[PDB]
Each structure stands twice: as C-alpha cells, then as structure tokens.
C-alpha cells in the first residue's frame with residue numbers, strides 16, 4: 497500500500513504545516529501537525545476542556561462506530577518549547593491520503609496548553625518519531641507509520657515541505673520526480689527516539705565550507721533551525737545590524753538587510769537553504785526589526801533541523817531494519 501497527502505503552511509511565515517487526516521467511521525477530518533520529533537497522535541476532542549477550545553475542529557469518539565476506549569489508559573506530553581497536552585486513549589481507524597490503519601491509538605485531549613488553544617488552525621499532532629517515545633500508559637502505543645509499515649510497498653515516508661506553498665507527505669514510496677540529483681542517505685541513531693543524525697558541516701553564503709560534526713534531529717514539528725552558538729554567531733555576523741536580543745529571545749535583524757544562504761552537509765552532499773527561508777518577519781506588527789530563522793540550541797540542549805532546513809530538501813525517513821535518513825535537493 498501507499499498514501500499521499502498535501503501539507504499546507506498554517507500562515508504566511510510557514511510557522512507550521514497541517515495535513516488532513518480522516519479519523520473514525522464515518523470519517524471525521526482533522527488537520528494535524530505531522531511531527532517527526534514526537535510519537536503521539538493526539539487530537540482536540542469532545543472531551544477537551546471547553547475553555548481551552550477556540551476554533552479547532554474536534555474529534556467526537558461517541559460518533560465513531562469503530563472507536564474503542566482503552567479503559568484506564570492515559571497520555572501526557574510536554575514538548576521542548578514548554579507546551580503540553582494530556583488525556584485518555586481510543587483506538588480507531590485512521591487514514592492519511594488513502595492509506596488506512598485500523599486500531600490506531602488516537603489520543604483524546606482533556607487538557608491542552610495556551611499555545612495550542614491560541615492556534616485555531618492546528619487540530620492536533622500526528623507523531624512520526626520512534627514509538628519508544630510514545631507516552632501512553634500502561635501500554636506504549638505505536639505511531640501511525642509503525643502500524644502501517646509492514647503493509648507499505650516500502651518501509652519509508654517522505655517529507656516535501658514547501659516554502660510559502662503546499663507540499664507533500666508520502667508513505668510507502670519515493671517519488672523520483674520530486675527532487676533533483678540523487679538522494680544521499682546518512683546514519684540514524686534511535687537512542688533518544690528521534691530521527692537523529694550527524695551533519696558533516698556548514699557554510700554561510702558563498703563562504704568556505706567548514707567541516708564539523710553537528711549531531712541533531714530531523715524535526716518537522718519545529719519551525720526553525722537550531723544550531724550550536726558558534727555556528728549561529730558565524731551566520732548572523734554576515735548580516736548587517738543583526739543582534740541577539742535578550743528581550744526577544746534570539747537573533748533579530750533589520751528587515752531590509754540581505755540574508756545570505758545557509759548550507760548544511762549530508763555526507764559529501766550539500767543542502768542549500770536560501771536566505772529568504774531564514775526571514776520570519778517583523779518582531780511585532782509594524783516593526784522594522786525582524787525575527788531570524790536560525791537560532792542557538794544552547795538553551796534547548798539539542799540541535800534541531802526544523803522546517804527552515806527540511807523545506808529546502810526532499811527528505812526520506814527510511815524505516816528499514818536499520819533506519820536511515822535521506823536528503824535530496826529540489
């Protein structure tokens with residue numbers, strides 16, 4: 497089997513991407529944030545505290561004839577950025593772009609934090625990291641990809657995120673027309689439950705490539721590119737007027753200043769992020785100071801190849817016996 501779904505930016509800044517997902521019988525379609533940095537499929541629901549729902553589409557398990565409650569089961573997640581959610585657990589039929597999994601754990605939110613409430617465009621998350629991170633208790637539940645894997649033509653999914661444009665998540669096949677040149681595959685460590693890999697280095701603009709190992713994760717659920725302070729300082733030093741602002745919580749730059757590209761290494765291959773992918777616009781409405789898309793990982797404790805990086809590439813999440821990651825230019 498295979499599946500193919502369009503993923504769309506939630507706003508003009510590409511802050512996140514949503515993908516339609518069918519849950520239950522008859523189908524209830526919710527727009528979920530596919531997140532390769534976590535492993536829970538959770539949704540706004542009829543059980544969500546009413547004051548914490550503001551415009552989201554909700555899943556109503558009582559109206560699904562295929563929904564089954566896991567009696568006593570709970571889930572609770574705290575994301576790296578402080579946000580959180582928790583609730584109980586059902587199994588139900590879940591389909592993405594034509595690909596169907598029966599018995600998928602659908603985690604119904606009783607509570608969500610303020611950032612989730614304030615974002616009306618995201619109805620939940622669909623985790624695509626390794627299932628060892630899944631928070632369901634007493635029995636850990638598998639991700640949608642893990643459940644579908646055996647049935648897929650090939651045990652893989654791909655992320656093709658657009659810049660200010662729609663893109664595609666494919667399951668079970670590699671669309672050879674979606675990228676240029678070849679796909680370079682690189683080793684993955686699953687020790688932390690992430691699609692964790694080691695980049696071979698970086699360049700800023702037309703500068704010389706610096707060979708250096710950067711361990712980080714391929715994370716579609718994180719907007720920005722978070723790298724070591726030394727690397728980030730080298731990037732913003734090439735931007736006139738750029739400063740790290742303690743009040744804003746990272747690097748900002750004069751909105752009209754030219755942004756150089758940022759190149760990262762995948763083995764001997766190179767992925768080039770165009771300068772404008774790094775522009776996240778005025779820090780507040782009407783300001784001529786703009787937020788930067790490359791930031792230090794020093795406070796986070798882990799380097800993150802988020803949407804800013806991934807959307808410059810066609811990315812293969814290869815779930816073979818020994819998982820690997822593939823990157824191609826496009």
Ligand SMILES: O=C(CCNc1ccccc1)Nc1scc(-c2ccccc2)c1C(=O)NCc1ccccc1
Nearest residue numbers: 511512529533575576577578579615717718719720796
């Ligand atoms: O990048 C984000 C959230 C992006 N989503 C978004 C939605 C609406 C408006 C704007 C943005 N948050 C960050 S920054 C850095 C991390 C992080 C990840 C792993 C480990 C340490 C830090 C996360 C994060 O927690 N991402 C998961 C997430 C969070 C909230 C919503 C969706 C996904």
